[PDB]
Amino acid sequence: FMSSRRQSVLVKSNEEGIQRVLTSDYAFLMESTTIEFVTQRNCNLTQIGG
Amino acid sequence: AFLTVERMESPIDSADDLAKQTKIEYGAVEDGATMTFFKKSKISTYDKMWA
Ligand SMILES: *[C@@H]1O[C@H](CO)[C@@H](O[C@@H]2O[C@H](CO)[C@@H](O)[C@H](O)[C@H]2NC(C)=O)[C@H](O)[C@H]1NC(C)=O
Ligand SMILES: *[C@@H]1O[C@H](CO)[C@@H](O)[C@H](O)[C@H]1NC(C)=O
């Protein structure tokens, strides 16, 4: 998917990636420690999956 | 019982919902630009449509 959808779903920063989840149905992939920081500071986000 | 299965049907809205139901038949132009795309694609949805 990501090879076919470059400059569409491939954001270049974490702050614009969390915002893209905050706008559309976006399922951003990143490191687990920062997700444990964002989810505890934002009650509209969650960590699904292991 | 009528009003809960006349909603639980989910008619076709994307290729993802149409990738599963092999009852509704797929289709393409024979060796055009559309058939060439699904033959070379590696996406999980679009390879099952070529199957
Ligand atoms: C869950 O909540 C809202 C209400 O339907 C949806 O959010 C909208 O999604 C569309 C689709 O991209 C956006 O254009 C709108 O700007 C969104 N509005 C708001 C207020 O967020 C959302 O899509 C719903 N469904 C999910 C997450 O699957
Ligand atoms: C999600 O929650 C945060 C803080 O709780 C809020 O600022 C934001 O507007 C909320 N977003 C939506 C789409 O409700």
PDB file of all heavy atoms in Angstrom, chain A residues 1 4-5, chain B residues 37 43 46:
ATOM      1  N   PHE A   1       0.827  -1.201   0.000  1.00  0.00           N
ATOM      2  CA  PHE A   1       0.000   0.000   0.000  1.00  0.00           C
ATOM      3  C   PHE A   1       0.863   1.253   0.000  1.00  0.00           C
ATOM      4  O   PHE A   1       0.655   2.156  -0.817  1.00  0.00           O
ATOM      5  CB  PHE A   1      -0.925   0.004   1.217  1.00  0.00           C
ATOM      6  CG  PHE A   1      -1.981   1.083   1.188  1.00  0.00           C
ATOM      7  CD1 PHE A   1      -3.169   0.880   0.508  1.00  0.00           C
ATOM      8  CD2 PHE A   1      -1.779   2.304   1.826  1.00  0.00           C
ATOM      9  CE1 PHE A   1      -4.147   1.858   0.483  1.00  0.00           C
ATOM     10  CE2 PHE A   1      -2.756   3.280   1.812  1.00  0.00           C
ATOM     11  CZ  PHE A   1      -3.938   3.060   1.133  1.00  0.00           C
ATOM     12  N   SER A   4       2.573   2.305  -3.109  1.00  0.00           N
ATOM     13  CA  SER A   4       1.662   2.798  -4.135  1.00  0.00           C
ATOM     14  C   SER A   4       1.035   4.127  -3.733  1.00  0.00           C
ATOM     15  O   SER A   4       0.502   4.850  -4.581  1.00  0.00           O
ATOM     16  CB  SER A   4       0.575   1.759  -4.416  1.00  0.00           C
ATOM     17  OG  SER A   4      -0.346   2.232  -5.382  1.00  0.00           O
ATOM     18  N   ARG A   5       1.088   4.461  -2.446  1.00  0.00           N
ATOM     19  CA  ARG A   5       0.412   5.647  -1.937  1.00  0.00           C
ATOM     20  C   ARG A   5       1.395   6.619  -1.302  1.00  0.00           C
ATOM     21  O   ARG A   5       1.103   7.194  -0.249  1.00  0.00           O
ATOM     22  CB  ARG A   5      -0.654   5.256  -0.913  1.00  0.00           C
ATOM     23  CG  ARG A   5      -1.720   4.327  -1.435  1.00  0.00           C
ATOM     24  CD  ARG A   5      -2.675   5.000  -2.381  1.00  0.00           C
ATOM     25  NE  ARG A   5      -3.746   4.074  -2.725  1.00  0.00           N
ATOM     26  CZ  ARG A   5      -4.732   4.343  -3.568  1.00  0.00           C
ATOM     27  NH1 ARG A   5      -4.800   5.524  -4.165  1.00  0.00           N
ATOM     28  NH2 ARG A   5      -5.656   3.425  -3.805  1.00  0.00           N
TER      29      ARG A   5
ATOM     30  N   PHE B  37      -3.334  -3.718 -14.748  1.00  0.00           N
ATOM     31  CA  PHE B  37      -3.054  -3.200 -13.411  1.00  0.00           C
ATOM     32  C   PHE B  37      -3.187  -4.284 -12.347  1.00  0.00           C
ATOM     33  O   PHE B  37      -2.338  -4.398 -11.456  1.00  0.00           O
ATOM     34  CB  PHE B  37      -3.985  -2.029 -13.099  1.00  0.00           C
ATOM     35  CG  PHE B  37      -3.788  -1.452 -11.730  1.00  0.00           C
ATOM     36  CD1 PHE B  37      -2.680  -0.672 -11.449  1.00  0.00           C
ATOM     37  CD2 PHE B  37      -4.712  -1.687 -10.725  1.00  0.00           C
ATOM     38  CE1 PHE B  37      -2.494  -0.139 -10.188  1.00  0.00           C
ATOM     39  CE2 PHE B  37      -4.531  -1.158  -9.463  1.00  0.00           C
ATOM     40  CZ  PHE B  37      -3.422  -0.382  -9.195  1.00  0.00           C
ATOM     41  N   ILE B  43      -0.930  -5.477  -3.871  1.00  0.00           N
ATOM     42  CA  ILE B  43      -1.761  -5.117  -2.730  1.00  0.00           C
ATOM     43  C   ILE B  43      -2.666  -6.302  -2.408  1.00  0.00           C
ATOM     44  O   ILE B  43      -3.087  -7.033  -3.312  1.00  0.00           O
ATOM     45  CB  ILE B  43      -2.549  -3.831  -3.050  1.00  0.00           C
ATOM     46  CG1 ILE B  43      -1.572  -2.722  -3.438  1.00  0.00           C
ATOM     47  CG2 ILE B  43      -3.367  -3.343  -1.861  1.00  0.00           C
ATOM     48  CD1 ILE B  43      -2.224  -1.514  -4.054  1.00  0.00           C
ATOM     49  N   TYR B  46      -6.123  -6.243  -4.086  1.00  0.00           N
ATOM     50  CA  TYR B  46      -6.184  -6.235  -5.542  1.00  0.00           C
ATOM     51  C   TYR B  46      -5.591  -7.506  -6.133  1.00  0.00           C
ATOM     52  O   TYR B  46      -5.841  -7.822  -7.301  1.00  0.00           O
ATOM     53  CB  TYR B  46      -5.466  -4.997  -6.077  1.00  0.00           C
ATOM     54  CG  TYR B  46      -6.115  -3.684  -5.677  1.00  0.00           C
ATOM     55  CD1 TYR B  46      -5.369  -2.514  -5.627  1.00  0.00           C
ATOM     56  CD2 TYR B  46      -7.457  -3.620  -5.309  1.00  0.00           C
ATOM     57  CE1 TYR B  46      -5.942  -1.318  -5.244  1.00  0.00           C
ATOM     58  CE2 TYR B  46      -8.037  -2.428  -4.928  1.00  0.00           C
ATOM     59  CZ  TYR B  46      -7.275  -1.282  -4.896  1.00  0.00           C
ATOM     60  OH  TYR B  46      -7.851  -0.092  -4.521  1.00  0.00           O
TER      61      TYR B  46
END
